[model samples]
Target: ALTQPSSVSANPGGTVEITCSGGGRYYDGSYYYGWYQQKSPGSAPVTVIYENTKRPSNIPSRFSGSKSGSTATLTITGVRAEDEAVYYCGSADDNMNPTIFGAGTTLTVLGALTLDESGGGLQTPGGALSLVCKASGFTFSSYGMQWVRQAPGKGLEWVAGIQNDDTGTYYGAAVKGRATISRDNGQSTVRLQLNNLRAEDTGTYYCAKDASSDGGYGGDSIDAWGHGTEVIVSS
Candidate 1:
């Protein structure tokens, strides 16, 4: 029910606005709408805007939220390097039980970088699933893709990824036997294939650019991200 720009960029100390368009009422100076900031695809998000335009105690004044008709805008003033993160807007339906969320907006503080995800679909448990990511603004080999998944209201989960050198491919113990990731430099694509999907595997999958200095997946390693593609494993 909501849509947002896939990516946005602004110079440091510059102004930028990210818009989420959807049903009315949200951002109508009401509490039903909120904005979230995720440092990376592999991290949990923090609420920056609560009750529409009110910033939480810790949120800096530089970030502002407001409404215009059915569009929700999160404005940033004097942007900083730390402002490089993804923003997501969310609201609940009439019942306010099942919240609707917009595809996140990746804010690039200094320049531009992005990952485009495709090939997401629904599948029954025990079936196969494949997801792909194509990136820009960095060499495919410079920062290989790391496959991460985040379930509803949960922190990100590490899956499998191909290293920058394309010589190492690894997976989390939970998915090792059934998960496989491969790279195709010709297409600048990173593809993941998982056999025998489980209900637990259902979630939003993201391809994070491994910006680690050591080309590892350690803390603060992931820099840029793609809009996470949804995966449904059921029945």
Candidate 2:
């Protein structure tokens, strides 16, 4: 089983490092490892370091990746408030197939800062619902946060986002016209409202952020995510 530290902490402008332990006998170059940032529970994990020491073009230099023996490491230098999130290490077999992820490490800057979500687990079809993301600690309005969802054990999916600038709101095609994403700068919270819900909407919802929108598995996108709120829709 892959193993990782439970948590790590650093002060603003400082640095923090995380490690992922994996591989028994095949711990050498035969197995490739990558580092990911999961800001919230429900958001998609963003690739920071991958291919066992190669950083994605979009990943900032502050984040570095490496592998030695049976362990992989991710280092974040000059950490900022936004760097607070969970980190996961992933290892791929020589076949380049089947990625195994570590349990994850929670990184905290300071204080009792939190991002909370509401409305979860059960819903009726054709019903209307609202979910809230309450953020505390840093300047809540300083950045944009995306709302994502995961169905059971499937990969994370983008639901909508309340962007930082005049970009306004965005919604996934799956729920376009039937959903709305909004935020209240005064309350320091973001809201996702769903109208005419369907059974297909059943899943866990999350709030997350990253450096840019271009980051994904092969790219430098999908950085931090929230813990997630489980949602279930029934007829």
Candidate 3:
């Protein structure tokens, strides 16, 4: 059970450094490491650094690996947009176990914004709904998530949001008490919830960083939006 950061950011053409602390067997950086990168969800991960600090074929030279003490580090010099992805650091512990992995770190390019949404589908009236928006490209704790909905071709509708500082929550006048939202600092994901759904809730729900308040708490416009997921209600 190695440990790694949950998220990190760097601008393009710069450098990014991520570390995986040695745990279990390799406590002194004696054993080699395997660094991997996964571009997006559902995609196969490729090795960026292997056998201590060797790059697999076709891997850019900018990507390098090293070990200092009980920590293994992956460094990307002259970072690029394509460098933005989740990286996992791993190594062996036992013959049967094969290897141990870190929690994984998402490398995001600063200034650019992105969101990945999951959890939406058909539902019945009076049912409950939930959705998650995983964001990158900004300091997640520095901003909050806003939930907005659009019924097919209909106009955007504000649902609710948790404050950037998380001191308070705001909801649209239309769905006030029925809506809820929360942000997870570790996963960089925001979750929105709605109870006792109505057929009117059928639509695509979008999650955007509550960039409105910036850090002061007064904006309501959706800046960067998740791809948005559709919720259908029937029966």
Highest lDDT: give the candidate number: 1
> 16-122, model 3: which lDDT tens digit per residue?
89988754343333665667676754343456876557675578999998877657789999999988888867654332222345667889997656787788989
Clash count, candidate 1: 0
- Ranking of predictions according to TM-score: 1, 2, 3
The window of 10 residues in a row where model 2 has the poorest summed lDDT is 213-222
Query: What number of clashing residue pairs does each candidate have, in the order they appear?
Result: 0, 13, 0
* 1 or 2, greater by TM-score: 1
Off by over 4 Å in 3: 1-112, 212-221
Question: Can you write out model 2's per-residue Cα lDDT over 1-235, one digit (the tens) per residue?
Answer: 4678988889888878787766433433355566777676556466677666877677789988766776677888888888787776655322222234566688999753466888786888999889998887756666666676767655445577655652546566678789887788788888889989888898888776533332212111234456778888996
| lDDT of each candidate versus the true structure | 0.70, 0.67, 0.69
Model 3 pairs whose backbones collide: none
- Model 1 global lDDT (CA atoms, 0 to 1): 0.70
Candidate 2 off by > 4 Å: 1-113, 212-223
Q: Mind sharing the TM-score for model 1? A: 0.54
TM-score of 2: 0.53
Q: Please rank every candidate by lDDT, starting with the best.
A: 1, 3, 2
Better of 2 and 3 by lDDT: 3
What are the candidates' C-alpha RMSDs?
14.3, 11.1, 17.3
